[PDB]
Structure 1
Amino acid sequence: KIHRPRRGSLAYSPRKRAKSIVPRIRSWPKDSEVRMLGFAGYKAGMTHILMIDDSPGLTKGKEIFVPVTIVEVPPLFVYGIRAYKQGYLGLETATEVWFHDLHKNVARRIKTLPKNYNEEAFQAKLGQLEDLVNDGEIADVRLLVHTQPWLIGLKKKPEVMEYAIGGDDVKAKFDYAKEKIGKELRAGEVLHEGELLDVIAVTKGKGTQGPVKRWGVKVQFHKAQRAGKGRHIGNLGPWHPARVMWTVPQAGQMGFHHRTEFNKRLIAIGENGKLVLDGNEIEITPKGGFPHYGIVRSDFLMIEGTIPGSFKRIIRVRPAIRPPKKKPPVERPQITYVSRESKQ
């Protein structure tokens, strides 16, 4: 006989359209630094730089070529604190506290906002939460966040999410949260330059596709091409078992999947659309803008390589949950050149 490995992976099945456009983070890393474990933004475009290699391995100490993805990140607004307790099987929500004066555009997502809810009641509810957290029935604390697209002119309907906090304790977490609620978070207060990140997003749509493109099936011989069966597979299976198995390549939806990617290095965090190299202040937006995305105004991240999704899509980053043992240092690498030329 002849052997080869099967065509495609059974680890990303069922290959179906994502339940939502906003991604979902299922697991969170073990960090000791008490801080928010992630941030969110909108993707703008790609370009390239030249930098002196800091990462272990030959090519270290030389000038190389590095492609880069720019992620636009205006500040977030913290509007909630949420407690969790332990039930029979797993965690379960216990209490929520919201802030009172929320933007007029949050009701584009959450139509049913409360009516009286002044600062009196806000502070009373906070106090109740604290008297609960000092008891012992509490397992972890998380923050509720919403984005502000009105600043960059992208849209008005916002995105709402729930992020976790670092640390083994809950009262330190509550102090952090109680200090942060009602205000804005910027990315420099949370993310460091040089960290490894995991990026999380929803991929581009390709539509209904066949098995040649969707699983890697080999095109058939030219006689079958002239017979009407070239981009088809040959067999749906054997005679016994007398049913089709789920492992047989078929056609269907390709793209718009919820994906994750490990270990992408954050290189630079900028302020107001400009990158201040050691020497001088510079812009990142190229001549003529970015294709399919305009000009960058607020704040942005440089990410080494590629990430999942189309341009104006919502991305979510977290610190690496699966890092190696030989890490590159945490500091902005020496950058010698950044491309501002036309990308269209």
Structure 2
Amino acid sequence: KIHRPRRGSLAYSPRKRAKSIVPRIRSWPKDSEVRMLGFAGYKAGMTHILMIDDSPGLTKGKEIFVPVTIVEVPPLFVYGIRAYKQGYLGLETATEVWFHDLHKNVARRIKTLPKNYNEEAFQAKLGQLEDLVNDGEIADVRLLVHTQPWLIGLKKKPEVMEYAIGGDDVKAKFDYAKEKIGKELRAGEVLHEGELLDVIAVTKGKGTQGPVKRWGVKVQFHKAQRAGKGRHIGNLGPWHPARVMWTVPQAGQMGFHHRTEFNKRLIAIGENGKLVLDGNEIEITPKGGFPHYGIVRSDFLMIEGTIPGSFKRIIRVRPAIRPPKKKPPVERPQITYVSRESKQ
């Protein structure tokens, strides 16, 4: 008998097409600072830098090559506040409050907007929600946010999302939300340079693939390659049980999956397309523009490593639900070189 591990993981099944291109966040981290727990942007491209190492471990204090991804982040708009209560099993929405003046383009996602809904009505609804929250029934408060893709001329149909707030007092959360609603919100007010983040997006699509590539199955002997079975698995199982088991590798959809990554470091936050290294203001956009993505012009995040998704895809970010015990400092590192040469 020969032993070896099975081919592929069963933890990401069923391997099907994602429900939506806009990714959903299932869990939130416990933070003591009262702030919005995430942001959203669009992926632009990749480059590399040379920085002085900070994190614990060998290589500390030396100049190292580091791959980098760039995410364009125009400001979000806060258009609503939601209240949650506790039902029999879990949380259930108690009520919603919206802002009265919304951009003309929001109707491309939300086809049915209210007709008149003036400011005094909005304020009365805010007051009702305030008094409701001021009793003790309510358990959680969340913000309702929409992207503004028209500033960077990428498209006009926004993405609409819900974001949680940190802390442990509903009243503090509500004060924050009431001071935020109806306005534009920037990434520098939410994120801190040097943090660890979790990124969420839908992966690149690859269509239907066979088991060699979908599961890491082996290619058969060359006699079978000449017989007509090279890229096939041997058998679907034994005589008894007299059925095919769900654990047997098979062909199907590959790519376009919901996936989450852990502990990617935020290096720097840029403004208006520039980064400030040593007093200078340099452009991240390489000579000729990013391939399949043009010029960065509003604001951008520099994230260490790689992240799921194609280029113009929507990315969501949250802070470190599962960080290690020896975190690196929350401070922008010392950067000696940023590459902005042609990338095609």
Q: What's the TM-score once normalised by structure 1's chain length? A: 1.00
1:187 is paired with a residue whose SS is coil
Deviations 1:152-179 (A, max 9, x none): 0000000000000000110000000000
Deviations 1:219-250 (A, max 9, x none): 00000000000000001000000000000000
1:41: how far off? 0.2
1:151 is paired with a residue whose SS is coil
1:279: how far off? 2.8
Distance, in Å, in 2 between the alignment partners of 1:15 and 1:192 is: 35
Q: What's the TM-score once normalised by structure 2's chain length? A: 1.00
2:21 is paired with a residue whose SS is coil
Distance, in Å, in 2 between the alignment partners of 1:167 and 1:132 is: 19
2:213 is paired with a residue whose SS is helix
Distance, in Å, in 2 between the alignment partners of 1:63 and 1:104 is: 50
Distance, in Å, in 1 between the alignment partners of 2:169 and 2:219 is: 58
Distance, in Å, in 2 between the alignment partners of 1:125 and 1:277 is: 48
Distance, in Å, in 1 between the alignment partners of 2:226 and 2:339 is: 49
1:246 is paired with a residue whose SS is coil
Deviations 1:267-320 (A, max 9, x none): 000000000113311110000000000000000000000000000000000000
2:172 is paired with a residue whose SS is helix
Greater mean alpha carbon deviation, residues 275-284 or residues 176-185: 275-284
Q: Aligned ranges for residues 93-242 of structure 1 at < 5 Å?
A: 93-242=93-242
2:261 is paired with a residue whose SS is strand
1:326 is paired with a residue whose SS is coil
Distance, in Å, in 2 between the alignment partners of 1:284 and 1:301 is: 11
Match of 1:249 in 2: 249
Deviations 1:101-143 (A, max 9, x none): 0000000000000001000100000000000000111000000
Match of 2:53 in 1: 53
Match of 2:291 in 1: 291
Distance, in Å, in 2 between the alignment partners of 1:169 and 1:231 is: 58
1:149 is paired with a residue whose SS is coil
Distance, in Å, in 2 between the alignment partners of 1:327 and 1:216 is: 34
In structure 1, stretches of 5+ residues that fail to align are none
1:163 is paired with a residue whose SS is strand
Distance, in Å, in 2 between the alignment partners of 1:60 and 1:235 is: 51
- The share of aligned pairs that are identical, in percent, is 100
In structure 2, stretches of 5+ residues that fail to align are none
Distance, in Å, in 2 between the alignment partners of 1:9 and 1:88 is: 35
1:89: how far off? 0.3
Distance, in Å, in 1 between the alignment partners of 2:102 and 2:187 is: 21
Distance, in Å, in 2 between the alignment partners of 1:341 and 1:299 is: 20
Match of 1:76 in 2: 76
Greater mean alpha carbon deviation, residues 279-288 or residues 70-79: 279-288
1:202: how far off? 0.2
Distance, in Å, in 2 between the alignment partners of 1:314 and 1:278 is: 32
2:127 is paired with a residue whose SS is helix
User: What is the aligned-residue RMSD (CA, Å)?
Assistant: 0.3
2:31 is paired with a residue whose SS is coil
Distance, in Å, in 1 between the alignment partners of 2:273 and 2:100 is: 32
Distance, in Å, in 2 between the alignment partners of 1:86 and 1:296 is: 44
Distance, in Å, in 2 between the alignment partners of 1:153 and 1:189 is: 24
2:46 is paired with a residue whose SS is strand
1:198 is paired with a residue whose SS is strand
Distance, in Å, in 1 between the alignment partners of 2:6 and 2:135 is: 55
